[PDB]
């Protein structure tokens, strides 16, 4: 397929996999990541005996956290439960090991996911006013995860996603847009291939064409679909063909070229990003989880085991931190070694000054939730920008500021 990546340098692929490798040893509840496991299984690489151990740890964690103790011992909280979107990714990890969800525990998890989607459908409502409590991204992911296990949702559930894709100047905010379209597209694709909602067949077919149209519309002059980090998900979808056009073929050539050029510059550091990219580089997508091949050999991944000693005096950078959207504005000047993350900078400011911040765990790493005591509310988030007004494309743990940058933390409501 013209949208498939064929010409990748194997040593670049190995380098990407090597970044995932140490995560295979990070087995705590808040570090376990079903997306990383899926990513490796659909790649051309393997982390040996570490993989099965990782999946056993996922099985233990998700099952014990999400299932039972009915009369919960004086708390109603303490454990750090995975979310329902995270449960969907867990269902994808099972498929990646060529398993179907089964037994009583399995049926219980399936019910919890179906209930999540039903609660989301009702939050949307009558089709008009109402957003999901989470996102259309997670809604799409839930449908897809049930679908690859051959579990059906009601026509009305699929209907809310179809409507969201269909109706006018579209619902989707710019940040989520390409990624959500790609994930919606993959759900539709699974539903079409599996014939789970036959009464919606034609509507699903048309929505698939519409998703492709919107993704192409979002191609940047560089050739990314949306941005570099949404390009792997979009290519996961577009490799699934359907409607081959010359416009699509041309778009895909530009996108693969842009993605390849970006890989030459160590662009992908975030494990979750790598996990979405590795399948594309092996001509696979989440839709392949309908009938996975666990018999196909993968190349063994070994660590670097070297680590570069300069024995030097490092270059320093001067950065200005700024906080806006709260009543008294805050600014902080720090000088740090070149290569320090924004997270390091925030920790430095908290240590050597009156800055304070809090994060919560996510599959993408530390998510910024509070700044100077102000926790982000219900439909609010702490947006991270390079001044002026340019939202960053990496989170706090991965963004490495350059000399003389002013970074802004802005409480916004989207
Ligand atoms: C929906 C979404 C959001 C929502 C999430 C809130 C909501 N109502 O759900 C909002 C709008 C708040 C958001 C914010 C941001 N996002 Co966002 N987001 C997504 C999206 C579309 C889906 C995430 C999801 O639900 N995944 C599934 C569930 C099961 O996973 P999860 O880990 O449990 O989900 C949580 C995290 O993803 C977290 N989150 C969302 N975005 C980001 C980004 C980072 C870096 C981290 C650590 C966490 C995080 O919110 C989710 C819980 O609500 C992804 C797309 C993708 N390809 O993954 C982008 C994506 C993860 N976001 C991205 C970015 C860059 C950001 C921001 C840094 C943008 C900015 N400059 O402020 C901020 C985060 C800043 C912060 N406060 O730490 C990038 C990350 C790229 C990279 N190199 O890692 C992605 C890949 C999109 C893209 N193509 O650029 N995001
Ligand atoms: Cl990254």
From Swiss-Prot:
Carbohydrate-modified residues: 76
Quaternary structure and partners: Interacts with CD320 (via LDL-receptor class A domains).
Binding site for cob(II)alamin: 86, 134-138, 175-179, 227, 230, 276, 382-384
Keywords (A to Z) from UniProt: Cobalt, Cobalt transport, Disulfide bond, Glycoprotein, Ion transport, Metal-binding, Secreted, Signal, Transport
Descriptive protein name: Transcobalamin-2
Domain of life: Eukaryota
InterPro entries in alphabetical order: Cbl-bd_prot, Cobalamin_Transport
Family membership: Belongs to the eukaryotic cobalamin transport proteins family.
Keyword Secreted assigned: yes
